[PDB]
Design a binder for this molecule. Structure first.
Ligand SMILES: COc1ccc([C@@H]2CNC(=O)C2)cc1OC1CCCC1
Ligand SMILES: [Mg+2]
Ligand SMILES: [Zn+2]
Length: 323
């Protein structure tokens, strides 16, 4: 409505507020945002994607995200897709990516947690879920979100890539698989270490813009971009970040409840009788988020300085919340 258009003014901005846009779109954040993103970047015009076909695909996809799961619902995909959309425009990455790589990264963000059940890879493996057997324990969740998302492009009324070259559907299907698999947290370190090596040997043009050789380097930056977008809640305005903290702790504690119901051992950050929400967020910033964004900032400097500042600041709020 009228509040929707006022909010979508901030589309291309880190301050954008995803809750507000969920409330104004009949609980369809992901469809509203993805649709605004394509228009903005002119993707439908570029890849002859019909608008009907696009809405039908998104709506279906949004509706495969479970709405009774506290954190991994359509809101989070919408968030990660909007965050990625901004990082893609960061000044240090200007004119570096092809249209196809841009469409790949945002699409990756959109389908990247689809059909998530609200339990970890570790849980699903220890309970012998169908999914763990299906996937032999390797990026269980991630391989699944990728299969669902690419299955839904089977219908004609949903094949939004129907007007790419064969070579383009392949080059894309490859980039997406690579980016979603990289959001599996057990790959975090390898990715961070790989990022640090890329910064070490960074090269720019005379105008402070990165020089990325060919495929290998371009997709490593995209890998890392969607992984920062996935771990961007603490770089967002305090009000937004605490609402994200509440939802993730909700989801985590429902998992701790199911673990206990079943005599299994409870993972301490999922234990609702001993885990401080506050200590845990500080830890999450000190050992995972800051190390990553610090490295990202070095790569696109000084574009992410504001982001680093917001982060240290949000850090100290949570620190000051602990006795
Ligand atoms: C807003 O914070 C968080 C945001 C996102 C996630 C991802 C989804 N699940 C993950 O393991 C990473 C975890 C968070 O916090 C958890 C780390 C321990 C405290 C809660
Ligand atoms: Mg995920
Ligand atoms: Zn995610």
């Amino acid at each position: 409505e009228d509040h929707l258009a006022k909010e979508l003014e901030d589309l291309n901005k880190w301050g954008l507020n995803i809750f507000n846009v969920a409330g104004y779109s009949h609980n369809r954040p992901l469809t509203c945002i993805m649709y605004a993103i394509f228009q903005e970047r002119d993707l439908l015009k570029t890849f002859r994607i019909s608008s009907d076909t696009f809405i039908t695909y998104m709506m279906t996809l949004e509706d495969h995200y479970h709405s009774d799961v506290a954190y991994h619902n359509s809101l989070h995909a919408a968030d990660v897709a909007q965050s990625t959309h901004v990082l893609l425009s960061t000044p240090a990455l200007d004119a570096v990516f092809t249209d196809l790589e841009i469409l790949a990264a945002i699409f990756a963000a959109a389908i990247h947690d689809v059909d998530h059940p609200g339990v970890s890879n570790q849980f699903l493996i220890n309970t012998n879920s169908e999914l763990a057997l299906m996937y032999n324990d390797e990026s269980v969740l991630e391989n699944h979100h990728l299969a669902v998302g690419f299955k839904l492009l089977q219908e004609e009324h949903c094949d939004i890539f129907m007007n790419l070259t064969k070579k383009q559907r392949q080059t894309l299907r490859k980039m997406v698989i690579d980016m979603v698999l990289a959001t599996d947290m057990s790959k975090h370190m390898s990715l961070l270490a790989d990022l640090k090596t890329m910064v070490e040997t960074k090269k720019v043009t005379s105008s402070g813009v990165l020089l990325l050789d060919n495929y290998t380097d371009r997709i490593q930056v995209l890998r890392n971009m969607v992984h920062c977008a996935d771990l961007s809640n603490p770089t967002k305005s305090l009000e937004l970040y605490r609402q994200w903290t509440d939802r993730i702790m909700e989801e985590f504690f429902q998992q701790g409840d199911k673990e206990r119901e079943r005599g299994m051992e409870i993972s301490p950050m999922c234990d609702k009788h001993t885990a401080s929400v506050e200590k845990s967020q500080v830890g999450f910033i000190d050992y995972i988020v800051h190390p990553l964004w610090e490295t990202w900032a070095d790569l696109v400097q000084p574009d992410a300085q504001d982001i680093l500042d917001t982060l240290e600041d949000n850090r100290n709020w949570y620190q000051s919340m602990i006795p």
